[PDB]
RNA sequence: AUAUAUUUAUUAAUAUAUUAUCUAUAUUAGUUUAUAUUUUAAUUAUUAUCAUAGUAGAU
RNA sequence: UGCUGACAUGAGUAACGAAAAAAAGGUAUAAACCUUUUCACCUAAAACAUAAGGUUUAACUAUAAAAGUACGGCCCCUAAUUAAAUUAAAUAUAAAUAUAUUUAAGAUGGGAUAAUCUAUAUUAAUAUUUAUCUUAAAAUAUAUAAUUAUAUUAUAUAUUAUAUAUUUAUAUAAUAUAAACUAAUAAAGAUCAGGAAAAUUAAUGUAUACCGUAAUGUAGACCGACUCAGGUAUGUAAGUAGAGAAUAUGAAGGUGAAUUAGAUAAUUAAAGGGAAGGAACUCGGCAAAGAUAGCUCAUAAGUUAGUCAAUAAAGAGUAAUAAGAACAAAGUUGUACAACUGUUUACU
């Protein structure tokens, strides 16, 4: 197809090919770029694919050693995310992948 | 599509005589069966009782009270409030239910009319 | 021990045996009910063991059964409910349209049969004689809807 | 999963003997909406049974709804053997087929017509179908006994539904058998606790 | 395409009634029917006599009405129970009064 | 009739309006009534209000 | 013909007298969606179940003494 | 694309938008209702 | 198979007339088809309808 | 081009809205209504079930029958979203009001049990989208354990015969079509990465409320001023044929209509055929005509390497040689502009 001719995407085979942990995901509510008025404030935003926002830990408070179990695709950000598992505690969390 | 070039399909694969199971049912309906005329249900089998409580909605078992069967306006009066005032509770209750019954009888008739 | 429907059936049988209510009596005691019911003629679809009533629009199926038991002494075993539609009617096209009343009609099944008394002849009963009112109606139709030279046209 | 129930197929005598859910008997069901009748080997039924019977539907004989409330038991007919009951059921189905498809004109001629030449109706209720079913039942039973201990019996919903005990139902074969025309006990909600009543009846003759 | 003026009384009337083509003609070609001595059209059958003959044929060549036995031998009460009366619709009533909208054939005058 | 109107009080406002016709259009109301009624039924005297 | 007595085109409808009329008139039980439930003041009797059933409360049921 | 059929009935929607209770609930709708009452209207809302 | 006639010792055989060539059960849920079982449940002559006048050759 | 009413004129003119009718009888009242027979039309519909809608139009007033299981609402739960509601001082604000947070509402969605028929109450206690291949397994035949060729391969049930609890239960074995289709299962490919919200045992209960149910629904019964060739959601949609829901036919069902009868000039429309010629027509091949398999082969230059070009053109096999259903399939090239699939002036 002529639409395929210029379709490039980087291949990451180590990347996870499963669903994210469901407890760490919230629904990504769409807006269409409309503010509380209901009027288009930000132009050019609309009906994409359905998504879930992932609750990724930016603060990084708890401390202690945590093993990265897997690295995932995240639809709401250009970076990959890494599912950490706390070695002592056993608590599960997402983190921006290095 | 069907065409000049379309060769006919093969016949379906029949199961051999020995391998086929005998059917569970062997003996079917009688061939002698005949369409007889219908038999319409009759009142003769009923024994409708003479004191069926639904007769209480009628008056002397009449489909409709004629002018003569009705109580005339001059002969009849409604109750006076003072008259009612010296009647017992149970009596009043009974009177009320009699009134209601009478209304039902009339209501049936009135509707029909 | 036993299923629910079976228990209900047993209860009903017990109540019948007693000559008490064949059903659980409620607690909301209405001493002076104002509700009337219109016993209707039977349709072709019903049996001699059925009877149908026009009842109040706010009348319950259970309520009806209770009414039949206590007021009249009749025990309705099964009851159905048929709330009718209210078709639009108007006196004339100059007037506002409105619906005729939604009317509730409840069929009952009963353990003894019943057939209505036969409707009277035209000569016998004064009221049950549709010739006169129909004739009057026809005459009214003729006279109001008579326009020009149909005034001379002889009456039907 | 298990898809099929007892009702899901036609069941012959051997199957009944193996199981023994109910005694040897056939159930008959009035349609309160249209007046149509529905035969069945079991006290319940499905869409399959309806499809089997109502094969050539028209405006006069519409394919009935499967809604449970409008169906009510007209008649429960008990017989001397499972095989006999099966045969009766088959005969009834055959008769129905004849009336609808094969010998339809004769059936139509036999029926009651109104003015404007239609089979008499009140609403979409036609009271001829029930009558035919009673006549057809009588015929099928008679055929079964010609083809041919417990005395057989027909538990009626209603005693009125008989055409006349003199004119019909007094064949010599029936008399010899001891065909007892009983009726179902109406000491309860007949429509609502119908299944329970049928179970009780089944228990009674076993 | 469109009339330029209100057409006058004269000009509409001479248009309509002036030409013989547009007028009605006397029916000179009446004559006596030989079967009944009445007016009929020439080279035409008498509608009375042929109607009478058709009626005769109907009365003789009549397919017998099918009365089912079971309905013929019902009791009156039983019949009433089974097949009760009903209110006919306005449309139905209108249909029933055929004499309102159905024209029976008139008889011609007797010829002299 | 085939009415069912008699088992209710439906279209109440309309009925009131019809029932309580203005008195200055009373001749209008009764003209058509008179026409409708046969000779043996109709009376010459005025139907006074309750 | 829809009706045989009317051969020619009068301004009579297929059914009824007038198509038009006052649309603003209270709803009944028959009208509206599948979800539209009017009710007829008949059953403040028991209680609706969590699953969609109903459970009668007999102390709140009308007897006619 | 033929026009004319701009009305496309659906009872629920009508009652939401133009029903009495919708009018009552809003301030603006209440004002409308009042105005209609003042006029003499028989039918205040759908 | 039914109805009407004739023979025979109501039965069977023959003649005429009418109607019928269905149905039901098996092969793991449903539908269709196939075969088997069930039943009396037929294969030749000649027509017709529909498919742009079905298409084509003449006329 | 005054307003309202009444009545003219055009004019007894056009038109009567895609249409197949005939006879006999109801009825010596019927082109139009009902019946019977014949004929035709629709048939992955003009059928049968339904949704929404609506002057109940219906087979009607003696009127559309439900405790629940291939029954819906109501009810529980929430989405989108909504709310003169909610929090000395929630925040902002000429008033109106607006914002944030709570709570409440809100189906188009989720919701236990069931033919062996099933029991919902109270109290107490701690799931985007698509796919089912290959391999492997055993089965059936050819040849000399192993090869070759062919189908079969997870589930759905009755029968018969066994072994254990005791004719009712559990497990095992054997018997048994093809092609579609369903549900439920398992394993899994792609990036565009795929809703929300509402516990379990025990005892005690359960007399089962209300509303919807007619008919109409590719339409005369809704939205289009009309009984309007327009608009209108879903599921079945007999077989024969086929790749198929294409196309032909039509079992059954439904239908043949508020216009008829004749005549068929000129002329118009919508079709069919046409000698000799073959774009000479015309602004322009507009319109019309034109398909020598649709399956299996084969298929170039150029080129961004993509059978892109290609469904290449031509051409072959099967079929057919005088032809003899419908439907799919309608050339090749040069140049200008624009990469491309898309979007646009609802009605030039
Ligand atoms: Mg941008
Ligand atoms: Mg039930
Ligand atoms: Mg509706
Ligand atoms: Mg408009
Ligand atoms: Mg199967
Ligand atoms: Mg045969
Ligand atoms: Mg056709
Ligand atoms: Mg002037
Ligand atoms: Mg003319
Ligand atoms: Mg002209
Ligand atoms: Mg002219
Ligand atoms: Mg003309
Ligand atoms: Mg037309
Ligand atoms: Mg005639
Ligand atoms: Mg098909
Ligand atoms: Mg239709
Ligand atoms: Mg329909
Ligand atoms: Mg419907
Ligand atoms: Mg109900
Ligand atoms: Mg419910
Ligand atoms: Mg809520
Ligand atoms: Mg809600
Ligand atoms: Mg919902
Ligand atoms: Mg229906
Ligand atoms: Mg409309
Ligand atoms: Mg228009
Ligand atoms: Mg139309
Ligand atoms: Mg087609
Ligand atoms: Mg056909
Ligand atoms: Mg030429
Ligand atoms: Mg040539
Ligand atoms: Mg030129
Ligand atoms: Mg030139
Ligand atoms: Mg062209
Ligand atoms: Mg090359
Ligand atoms: Mg083409
Ligand atoms: Mg472009
Ligand atoms: Mg567009
Ligand atoms: Mg445009
Ligand atoms: Zn004569």
Curated annotation (Swiss-Prot), chain A:
Location of the protein in the cell: Mitochondrion
Domain of life according to the entry: Eukaryota
Entry function: Component of the mitochondrial ribosome (mitoribosome), a dedicated translation machinery responsible for the synthesis of mitochondrial genome-encoded proteins, including at least some of the essential transmembrane subunits of the mitochondrial respiratory chain. The mitoribosomes are attached to the mitochondrial inner membrane and translation products are cotranslationally integrated into the membrane.
Subunit organization: Component of the mitochondrial large ribosomal subunit (mt-LSU). Mature yeast 74S mitochondrial ribosomes consist of a small (37S) and a large (54S) subunit. The 37S small subunit contains a 15S ribosomal RNA (15S mt-rRNA) and 34 different proteins. The 54S large subunit contains a 21S rRNA (21S mt-rRNA) and 46 different proteins. uL2m has a Na/K ligand binding site.
Note, other: Present with 1600 molecules/cell in log phase SD medium.
Homology family: Belongs to the universal ribosomal protein uL2 family.
Protein name: Large ribosomal subunit protein uL2m
Organism this protein belongs to: Saccharomyces cerevisiae (strain ATCC 204508 / S288c)
From Swiss-Prot, chain B:
Composition-biased stretches (Basic residues): 1-10
Record's subcellular location: Mitochondrion
Segments of skewed composition (Polar residues): 24-34
Region annotation (Disordered) ranges: 1-41
Source organism, top-level taxon: Eukaryota
UniProt function note: Component of the mitochondrial ribosome (mitoribosome), a dedicated translation machinery responsible for the synthesis of mitochondrial genome-encoded proteins, including at least some of the essential transmembrane subunits of the mitochondrial respiratory chain. The mitoribosomes are attached to the mitochondrial inner membrane and translation products are cotranslationally integrated into the membrane.
Quaternary structure annotation from Swiss-Prot or TrEMBL: Component of the mitochondrial large ribosomal subunit (mt-LSU). Mature yeast 74S mitochondrial ribosomes consist of a small (37S) and a large (54S) subunit. The 37S small subunit contains a 15S ribosomal RNA (15S mt-rRNA) and 34 different proteins. The 54S large subunit contains a 21S rRNA (21S mt-rRNA) and 46 different proteins.
Family classification: Belongs to the universal ribosomal protein uL29 family.
Note: Present with 7700 molecules/cell in log phase SD medium.
Protein name: Large ribosomal subunit protein uL29m
The organism's taxonomic lineage, starting at the top: Eukaryota, Fungi, Dikarya, Ascomycota, Saccharomycotina
Section covered of the full-length record: 15 to 127 of 319
From Swiss-Prot, chain D:
Gene Ontology BP, a term: positive regulation of mitochondrial DNA replication
InterPro entries in the record: Ribosomal_mL67
GO molecular function: DNA binding; DNA strand exchange activity; single-stranded DNA binding; structural constituent of ribosome
A Pfam short name: Mhr1
Subcellular location: Nucleus; Mitochondrion
Main location: nucleus
Further remark: Present with 2610 molecules/cell in log phase SD medium.
PANTHER family hit by this protein: LARGE RIBOSOMAL SUBUNIT PROTEIN ML67, MITOCHONDRIAL HOMOLOGOUS RECOMBINATION PROTEIN 1
Subunit composition and interactions: Component of the mitochondrial large ribosomal subunit (mt-LSU). Mature yeast 74S mitochondrial ribosomes consist of a small (37S) and a large (54S) subunit. The 37S small subunit contains a 15S ribosomal RNA (15S mt-rRNA) and 34 different proteins. The 54S large subunit contains a 21S rRNA (21S mt-rRNA) and 46 different proteins.
Descriptive protein name: Large ribosomal subunit protein mL67
Organism from which the protein derives: Saccharomyces cerevisiae (strain ATCC 204508 / S288c)
Swiss-Prot record, chain G:
Annotated GO biological process: mitochondrial translation; translation
GO cellular component, one term: mitochondrion
GO molecular function, one term: structural constituent of ribosome
Keyword terms: Mitochondrion, Ribonucleoprotein, Ribosomal protein, Transit peptide
Subcellular location: Mitochondrion
Family of the protein in this entry: Belongs to the mitochondrion-specific ribosomal protein mL41 family.
Entry function: Component of the mitochondrial ribosome (mitoribosome), a dedicated translation machinery responsible for the synthesis of mitochondrial genome-encoded proteins, including at least some of the essential transmembrane subunits of the mitochondrial respiratory chain. The mitoribosomes are attached to the mitochondrial inner membrane and translation products are cotranslationally integrated into the membrane.
Note: Present with 2250 molecules/cell in log phase SD medium.
Subunit composition and interactions: Component of the mitochondrial large ribosomal subunit (mt-LSU). Mature yeast 74S mitochondrial ribosomes consist of a small (37S) and a large (54S) subunit. The 37S small subunit contains a 15S ribosomal RNA (15S mt-rRNA) and 34 different proteins. The 54S large subunit contains a 21S rRNA (21S mt-rRNA) and 46 different proteins.
Name of the featured protein: Large ribosomal subunit protein mL41
Organism of this sequence: Saccharomyces cerevisiae (strain ATCC 204508 / S288c)
Gene of this entry: MRPL27
Full-protein interval shown: 17 to 81 of 146
